């Protein structure tokens, strides 16, 4: 049960979902919890005096903000999500996130295209580290752009290869991929010539 924090009805739904899940052993996720710090303190105090089910899990997804309570930070286990350190790490994360079945489809050239996408995403994200030189500003090139690019590659490869096992590299719609990545998927966030 995924609930976005920020509304009073949101708090009611979060309380109801947690109360149901501690008995039913269900997972509850609460997003953007950093916008309700006092409610975070109340939630931590409620969580301490509780005996939930064995399989129950409560994920609280937030951004690193100085407003989160210290008690909540000490009560829970913290996982920090940030850009992967190296190009190798970024490519490993990209390959692990993408399911194996999606890459291994009917065209044998889909794996090469997915590897090219992974390398390009890693290069762009690491150039983002050096803001003055790599780009002109800190663009938000993230997992959403990678997912959109993967969906575009899948769609256009399926359109070009009508279920054929193998496709010639010359027949791959390079123009479609390049144009959609430069204008729509990755080039949307770019506001500089």
């Amino acid at each position: 049960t995924s609930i976005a924090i920020g509304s009073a009805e949101g708090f009611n739904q979060a309380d109801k979902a947690i109360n149901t899940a501690v008995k039913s052993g269900r997972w509850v996720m609460l997003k953007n919890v950093h916008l309700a710090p006092g409610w975070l303190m109340q939630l931590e105090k409620k969580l301490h005096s509780l005996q939930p089910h064995a399989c129950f899990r409560l994920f609280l997804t937030m951004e690193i903000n100085p407003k989160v309570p210290v008690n909540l930070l000490r009560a829970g286990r913290i996982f920090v999500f940030e850009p992967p350190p190296g190009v190798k790490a970024n490519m490993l994360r990209t390959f692990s996130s993408i399911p194996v079945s999606r890459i291994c489809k009917s065209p044998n050239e889909r794996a090469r295209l997915y590897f090219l996408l992974a390398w390009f995403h890693a290069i762009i994200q690491e150039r983002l580290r050096y803001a003055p030189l790599g780009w002109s500003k800190k663009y938000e090139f993230g997992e959403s752009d990678l997912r959109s690019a993967c969906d575009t590659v899948d769609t256009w490869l399926d359109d070009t290869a009508k279920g054929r096992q193998n496709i010639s590299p010359d027949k791959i719609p390079w123009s479609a991929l390049k144009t959609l990545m430069a204008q729509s998927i990755y080039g949307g966030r770019v506001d500089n010539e």
Binding site: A4, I5, G6, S7, G10, G142, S175, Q183
Partner: protein, 1622 residues
């Protein structure tokens, strides 16, 4: 006897006037023809007023008055009736047509049944006697109508659930307001009233078309007159229910559009694949079909042609038939361009423009395809382009057309859009289309972000219209919460429409996070809908919104338009950002837009003009000086292009008319070839840009225009008739008119520019420093337009910052989700409804106030081409064509670029209003308007004649003002503040001449003496108005400058400044010292609150204050605390017997609510034929709202104080707005006097220049050593008469006092601690303490007097000290001062260090030994443990001193304490002990976690009732921890400063209080019956009996914050610094 004829005419009209009655469905006879009756009443009232203006009026006065009354009553009655009737009508249609409403709401049905019976009986009575006068003479008709209106409003307010369910029945009703939906449901039988509601439900359907019977809907119509005839007409008879036949009409519209598109495509296939196109046949085809269908047919034909050509080219090496497609497109474009070069009907002209834009895009795309050598239909260079495929063989008409882009496929929605403005297809627009369709295919929203003016919202709307989708644009704000957004999403899902949310980031971050969930649910529902396995015959796709399963139409979409990096706004959460595909829009292709727009308008040199105009705009952006109101983006360019087209059309019309009236020869080609297109473009550029430019930038703009457009000249047209009308209006309004370079030329030019901007823009803004003629410019323009065009002009002046945004736009109830209108929303809705013919007038909504993004960005959709006001409850109010939104602002330092680009700008520099015109206006007003309400007029004319030489350019006053601008003043200097103060003083001089003439009736003042007096008083007023708010040195400097430059005789004294001289009524300078006697104060009134020792400064300031108050002019006194501002004001007011003063004390959290509560208490609102008037309850008196801390209230982040704006609105416009019913209320007999510390002092903010322009400021400074010595020597001489043997010590003692005070005021300043403020208030407290100590004694040596003096010095100057070194310095300096001024006395007998004084051990205030005092306190504490509190205390010397201080304070009237020290030091315990010993009842608020403002108000009410109504002394002990909110400190500030809270007792409580007060008076023996006397006695009792002890920790920043949050603690509460134990 013309008056008799007019009266006879009125009597004959009103004796034969009958209410026109028409049968209403055989139920009753409704009144018809409201407009005729209202116009007749208004014209007769105007005639009666004109009769009153006639000199003979008296002979008929009585009779005339009677008629006026009757007329007013008539209007009043029919001011209500219509509304009542209107409501009843539709309400009936809801309580009869729907048979189920009885079960849902039985109580509402019964209430309406009773109301309907009453209304029907009343209408039967009216039908019995249709005569208007007979209807007026019905007993209790007015009260019955008001009751009916209130009850009908209640039932209307109680129909929310039924309306929501009816919205659920018909989805489009989600976009219709409660009133409008109620009207639609009620008037289903009479569809004639539904024609104005279709603009909210449909994209382009302005109205529907029915037959003569009004039973079958034959077609639909748009706002420009375009019509669509249904193939199968929808009949209302077979489907009586409103939603049923509305749905049938919508479906028939879609089917008819599909069939018409099929026919149009079949017809246009002939034009395609044709080498030659006949212009006549093409124009016939264009005229035959709707604009959207024509463009769609052209697009389909071109797409099919290109597809066939690419299929042929598929062979690779084959020839290119794409050249044939390009040639055909060019031929058709040539035909269209030739067609638009000649005159065409407006609808056909717009169709031609749309076709030209489309064909230019198609030609560019085909040229790109040819250049790229594309030969395959599957090449992405062709797949990226949008393609239209028409399948006639398709059985379903709605699915015959498919629109594809890349891999995205859509079906045309076939929603009738009418004729919408079409954007040119720039490469950025193509990128927008590609990105948004890619987002839509992936079921993701679109987020085109970037700076304002880049065509994001318009591109989204153009894409939506290209797919034939209903696009609703919402201007989001922080008010759009989870529930409102969920309701909007439900409406979009059910309707199947596109929602463009402009300014999405303006929501709260939490609210954006909450909305992310609904957006995600909608997206998953759409994704599941898109699955091929899903079949439409199965269960429809639904999503959970607001805990309801709502059907999701696949056609819907969510787009958000964002302007990241601006003032206000927020940051979107990442989970919400992942739901939208973003797109950067930063550099739109202005060159292509300009070229295509000029080409489609008929310009022959479109390419050259575009290449000259776009770089020109870039040059303007990079060349002219940077200004806050400058905008040269794409909005300005688009306005210039539209104005260029309009001016070209006007020039063609002018040329045709001239040719017709000069011979007979007309040739459209000859006219087109002989046309100065460059000159037209220059004219438009000037008319659109020049008004906004500052004086220095105008030559730069003209030089740049010459550089880019050589050889062309702009000759501004001379609006002869408008200039004559302006002359007449300025003459009748005492204004100065000027043509060209004459005095007034710049102002008239600005007025003409403002008129030209009004004719172009529906949203204006007049920017310029205060005192630049903006307000008078637009008022004169409105009056001139009213006289010239004959159309009435109404102006609604709103101060946006004087009221909260909730009160300005409206609010949605969090619980019941009920929308209540604001001020601007109510005004706009009233204009749109046009109940009383508001749409036939010129309505100007003037936002006269500061502009900040938070409130002005809500008008973004209003000021765009949308012209819609979007409300969070789904309502969208269309801006009428006659409504203009104008902003009168002094600067745009805080306005975002999103606002400055949306409004036309007119810059009023301060130079357009020269000082000469202000002088001429003053002199004209003096010569025309008498001061009393004639000898007064003769005196005024003579005085104006005498003052004419000095009020001239390069005169005494002008040079004086120029020199005074170089001096330094306590506040920023403005021209009109000094000018208004001077004019007020001169009016007072005329009044003085009048009162002299009255006092000498046999010998009126002659011309010579009058001239002499006027000259002297003019110099006096110049000095006291141009330097009143300045220090003494600069007053002397201005005096010497006048002495050098003037020619009038001046006082001969060699060193006395002119500021020390007044002007006697005989016309001679006389020193002010002649009115400063050496009075002797009565002994019992020594240092009394109302005792004022007259000095030079006091008498001068009293005279100045009397001069300013006698004119009922708001004023301000500025100076250091304790200077004597309140004392001087009260002394001046004592000379004015018909003026009562009420004190309001401002704090950091002061809002207009304090002023509103004071008005509710001391004043009353009454209804008059001219509106609501707020006047004091006591007739014949003037209420003076004395504000003590006018500059303290918090200044928000946008540099505005809300209460100050409220005061400015009530001072300038003479009234305010009641937000209970949004009614303009005019103040009467209310005046504003304020007091303030210097703006440089900590916590004080500088007042706005707009506010200061109205209020003259007088600087009251600290009394000098001479003045202090004089005053307190008088006080000490009066005091020491108790003991004769000490009388000879009166002179030295005072000096000693002064000396010590001086050193303190130098040794301790605000730099060290915030409370280190020493003033003559401490000196007065010193004198009072010595007098009270000496009062009961019969004899005393000098040593005893010295001991009392030292004790008082210690108590006043050492209690507040923090550091021990400061206290040691005070001790040593007291010793040294006493020894120096009092030698030959026993030092040890008068300055033994344990100086303790107490009346515990005796009946008098005599010195006490420390040991005896300790024993007595120990015994009293032993008793105290048994009696009240069993907490043992350890007694040390500091405890004895502290309890002595606390006892000293509790023994005073209005004696409050501020105990500052570390917690646990015994402050509360000592306070309780001393209160118990003094008999005071200790009261502490029992605060807890749930404590709120209501609980504190109740506790305050209890304390005040106990202390004032029961005469019970109370020690209100309060801690800083008990302050849970700023409201607590606000109430405490008011209570401490005045002893009364104006808004604490309201409603029943007040009545109860009054009863108790009465009883209290009866217990005291006083004979009080009136409520005002009872409240005054209650306030006096509270002052005398309530002591408040406030205890707090010695924090630094906390003390500094408290010094501004509640000044009464540091002004009315005696501060004691206990500190930590030493």
């Amino acid at each position: 006897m013309a008056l008799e004829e007019f009266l006879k005419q009125i009597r004959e009209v009103w004796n034969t006037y009958e209410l026109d009655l028409v049968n209403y469905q055989n139920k009753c006879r409704l009144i018809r023809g409201w407009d005729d009756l209202f116009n007749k009443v208004k014209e007769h009232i105007n005639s009666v007023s004109a009769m009153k203006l006639s000199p003979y009026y008296k002979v008929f006065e009585e009779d005339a008055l009677s008629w006026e009354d009757k007329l007013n009553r008539i209007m009043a009655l029919f001011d209500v009736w219509i509304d009542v009737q209107r409501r009843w009508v539709y309400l009936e249609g809801i309580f009869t047509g729907s048979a189920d409403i009885k079960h849902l709401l039985p109580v509402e049905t019964q209430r309406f049944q009773s109301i309907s019976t009453e209304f029907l009986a009343l209408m039967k009575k009216v039908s019995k006697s249709p005569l208007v006068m007979d209807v007026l003479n019905i007993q209790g008709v007015q009260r019955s109508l008001e009751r009916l209106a209130d009850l009908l409003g209640k039932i209307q307010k109680a129909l929310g659930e039924y309306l929501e369910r009816e919205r659920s029945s018909f989805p489009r009703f989600y976009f219709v307001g409660d009133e409008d939906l109620l009207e639609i449901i009620g008037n289903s039988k009479n569809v004639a009233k539904l024609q104005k509601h279709f603009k909210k439900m449909f994209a382009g359907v302005s109205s529907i078309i029915l037959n003569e019977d009004n039973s079958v809907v034959l077609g639909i119509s748009s706002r420009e007159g375009e019509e669509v005839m249904f193939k199968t007409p929808v009949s209302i008879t077979e489907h009586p229910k409103i939603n049923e036949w509305l749905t049938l009409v919508e479906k028939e519209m879609r089917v008819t559009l599909a069939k018409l598109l099929a026919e149009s495509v079949t017809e246009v296939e002939i034009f395609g694949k044709a080498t030659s196109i006949d212009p006549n046949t093409y124009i016939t085809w264009i005229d035959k079909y709707q604009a959207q269908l024509v463009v769609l047919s052209a697009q389909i034909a071109w797409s099919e042609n290109v597809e066939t050509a690419l299929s042929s080219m598929g062979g690779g090496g084959d020839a290119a038939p794409l050249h044939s497609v390009l040639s055909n497109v060019e031929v058709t474009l040539n035909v269209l361009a030739d067609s638009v070069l000649m005159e065409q009907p407006p609808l056909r002209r717009r169709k031609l423009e749309h076709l030209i834009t489309e064909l230019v895009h198609q030609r560019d795309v085909t040229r790109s395809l040819i250049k790229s050598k594309i030969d395959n239909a599957k090449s992405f260079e062709w797949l990226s382009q949008m393609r239209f495929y028409f399948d006639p063989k398709q059985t379903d008409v709605l699915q015959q057309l498919s629109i594809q882009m890349a891999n995205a496929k859509f079906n045309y929605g076939f929603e009738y859009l009418g004729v919408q403005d079409k954007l040119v297809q720039t490469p950025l627009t193509d990128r927008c289309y590609l990105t948004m369709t890619q987002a839509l295919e992936a079921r993701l929203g679109g987020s085109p972000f970037g700076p304002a003016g880049t065509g994001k919202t318009e591109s989204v709307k153009a894409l939506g219209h290209q797919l034939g989708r209903f696009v609703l644009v919402f201007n989001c704000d922080e008010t759009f919460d989870f529930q409102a957004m969920g309701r909007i999403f439900v409406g979009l899902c059910q309707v199947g429409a596109w929602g463009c949310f402009d300014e999405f980031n303006r929501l709260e971050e939490r609210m954006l996070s909450a909305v992310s969930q609904q957006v995600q649910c909608i997206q998953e529902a759409l994704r599941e809908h898109s699955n091929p396995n899903y079949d439409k015959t199965s269960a429809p796709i639904t999503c959970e919104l607001l805990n309801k399963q709502v059907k999701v139409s696949p056609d819907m979409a969510i787009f958000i338009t964002m302007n990241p990096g601006y003032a206000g706004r927020s940051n979107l959460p990442d989970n919400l950002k992942k739901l939208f595909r973003s797109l950067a829009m930063t550099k739109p292709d202005r060159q292509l837009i300009a070229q295509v727009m000029l080409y489609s308008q008929g310009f022959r040199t479109a390419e050259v003009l575009a290449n000259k105009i776009v770089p020109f705009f870039k040059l303007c952006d990079e060349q002219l000086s940077s200004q806050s109101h400058y905008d040269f983006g794409l909005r300005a360019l688009k306005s210039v292009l539209v104005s260029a087209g309009n001016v070209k059309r006007e020039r063609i019309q002018k040329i045709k008319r001239e040719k017709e009236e000069r011979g007979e020869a007309v040739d459209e080609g000859e006219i087109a070839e002989n046309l100065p297109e460059q000159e037209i473009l220059i004219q438009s550029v000037c008319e659109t840009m020049v008004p906004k430019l500052v004086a220095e930038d105008i030559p730069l703009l003209f030089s740049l225009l010459s550089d880019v457009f050589p050889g062309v000249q702009y000759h501004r047209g001379e609006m002869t008739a408008l200039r004559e009308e302006l002359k007449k209006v300025c003459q009748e309004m005492y204004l100065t008119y000027g043509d060209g370079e004459e005095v007034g030329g710049m102002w008239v030019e600005k007025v003409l520019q403002l008129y030209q901007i009004t004719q172009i823009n529906h949203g204006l803004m007049m920017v310029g420093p205060s005192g630049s003629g903006k307000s008078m410019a637009w008022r004169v323009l409105l009056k001139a337009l009213e006289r010239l065009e004959g159309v009435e002009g109404v102006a609604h002046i709103i101060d946006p910052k004087a009221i909260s945004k909730d009160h300005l736009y409206g609010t949605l109830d969090p619980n019941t989700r009920e929308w209540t209108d604001g001020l601007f929303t109510h005004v706009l809705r009233k204009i749109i409804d046009s109940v009383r013919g508001e749409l036939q007038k010129r309505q100007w909504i003037v936002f006269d106030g500061d502009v900040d993004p938070e409130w002005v960005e809500n008008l973004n959709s209003v000021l765009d081409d949308n012209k819609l006001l979007t409300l969070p409850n789904g309502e969208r109010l269309s801006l009428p064509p006659n409504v203009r939104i104008m902003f009168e602002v002094q600067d745009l330092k805080y306005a975002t670029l999103a606002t400055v680009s949306r409004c036309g700008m007119v810059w009023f520099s301060e130079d357009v209003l020269s000082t000469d015109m202000i002088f001429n206006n003053f002199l004209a007003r003096l010569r025309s308007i008498p001061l009393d309400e004639s000898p007064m007029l003769q005196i005024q004319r003579d005085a104006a004649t005498i003052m004419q030489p000095y009020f001239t350019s390069n005169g005494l006053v002008t040079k004086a003002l120029e020199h005074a601008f170089q001096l330094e003043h306590i506040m920023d200097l403005t021209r009109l503040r000094c000018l208004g103060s001077l004019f007020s003083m001169l009016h007072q001089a005329c009044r003085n001449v009048a009162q002299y003439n009255a006092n000498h009736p046999d010998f009126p003042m002659q011309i010579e003496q009058l001239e002499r007096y006027i000259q002297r008083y003019l110099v006096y007023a110049i000095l006291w108005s141009l330097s009143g708010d300045s220090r003494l040195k600069m007053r002397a400097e201005l005096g010497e400058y006048i002495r050098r430059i003037t020619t009038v005789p001046l006082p001969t004294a060699p060193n006395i400044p002119i500021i020390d001289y007044e002007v006697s009524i005989s016309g001679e300078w006389s020193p002010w010292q002649a009115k400063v006697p050496q009075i002797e104060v009565e002994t019992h009134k020594v240092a009394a609150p109302d005792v004022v020792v007259p000095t030079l400064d006091t008498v001068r300031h009293e005279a100045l204050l009397y001069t300013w108050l006698a004119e009922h002019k708001p004023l301000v006194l500025c100076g250091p605390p304790g200077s004597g501002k309140t004392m001087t004001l009260f002394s001046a007011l004592r000379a004015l017997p018909d003026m009562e003063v009420v004190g309001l004390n401002f704090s950091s959290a002061t809002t207009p609510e304090l002023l509103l509560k004071t008005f509710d208490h001391y004043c009353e609102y009454r209804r008059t034929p001219n509106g609501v008037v707020l006047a004091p309850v006591q007739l014949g008196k003037w209420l003076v709202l004395f504000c003590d801390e006018i500059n303290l209230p918090d200044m928000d982040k946008y540099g505005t104080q809300r209460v100050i704006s409220f005061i400015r609105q009530m001072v300038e416009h003479g009234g305010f707005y009641r937000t209970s019913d949004q009614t303009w209320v005019k103040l009467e007999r209310i005046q504003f006097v304020g007091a303030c510390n210097p703006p440089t002092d900590p916590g004080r903010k500088p007042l706005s220049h707009r506010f200061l322009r109205h209020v003259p400021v007088v600087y009251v400074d600290y009394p000098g050593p001479a003045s202090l010595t004089q005053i307190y020597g008088t006080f000490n001489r009066a005091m020491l008469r108790l003991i004769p043997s000490l009388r000879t010590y009166a002179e030295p003692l005072t000096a000693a006092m002064v000396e010590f005070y001086t050193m303190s005021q130098e040794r301790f300043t605000q730099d060290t601690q915030p409370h280190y403020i020493y003033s003559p208030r401490e000196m007065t407290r010193w004198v009072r303490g010595i007098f009270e100590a000496l009062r009961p004694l019969e004899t005393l040596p000098v040593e005893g007097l010295i001991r009392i003096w030292a004790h008082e010095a210690l108590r006043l100057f050492q209690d507040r000290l923090v550091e021990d070194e400061e206290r040691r310095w005070t001790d040593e300096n007291i010793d040294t001062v006493a020894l120096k001024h009092f030698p030959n006395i026993d030092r040890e007998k008068a300055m033994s260090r344990p100086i303790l004084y107490s009346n515990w051990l005796s009946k008098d205030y005599i010195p006490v030994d420390q040991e005896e005092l300790r024993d007595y306190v120990k015994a009293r504490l032993k008793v105290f443990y048994e009696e009240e509190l069993d907490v043992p205390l350890v007694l040390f010397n500091e405890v004895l001193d502290h309890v002595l201080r606390i006892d000293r304070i509790f023994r005073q009237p209005q004696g409050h304490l501020l105990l500052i020290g570390v917690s646990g030091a015994g402050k509360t315990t000592l306070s309780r002990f001393v209160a118990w010993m003094n008999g005071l009842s200790v009261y502490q608020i029992k605060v807890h976690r749930k404590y709120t403002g209501e609980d504190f108000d109740e506790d305050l009410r209890t304390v005040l009732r106990r202390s004032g109504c029961k005469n019970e002394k109370i020690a209100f002990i309060m801690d800083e921890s008990n302050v849970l909110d700023s409201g607590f400190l606000e109430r405490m500030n008011t209570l401490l400063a005045n002893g009364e809270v104006p808004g604490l007792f309201e409603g029943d409580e007040y009545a109860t209080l009054m009863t108790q007060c009465k009883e209290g008076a009866q217990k005291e023996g006083l004979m009080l019956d009136s409520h005002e006397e009872l409240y005054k006695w209650f306030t006096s009792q509270v002052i005398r009996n309530l002591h408040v002890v406030f205890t707090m920790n010695p924090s630094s920043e906390g003390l500094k914050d408290r010094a501004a949050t509640s000044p009464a603690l540091f002004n009315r509460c005696v501060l004691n610094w206990f500190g930590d134990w030493s």
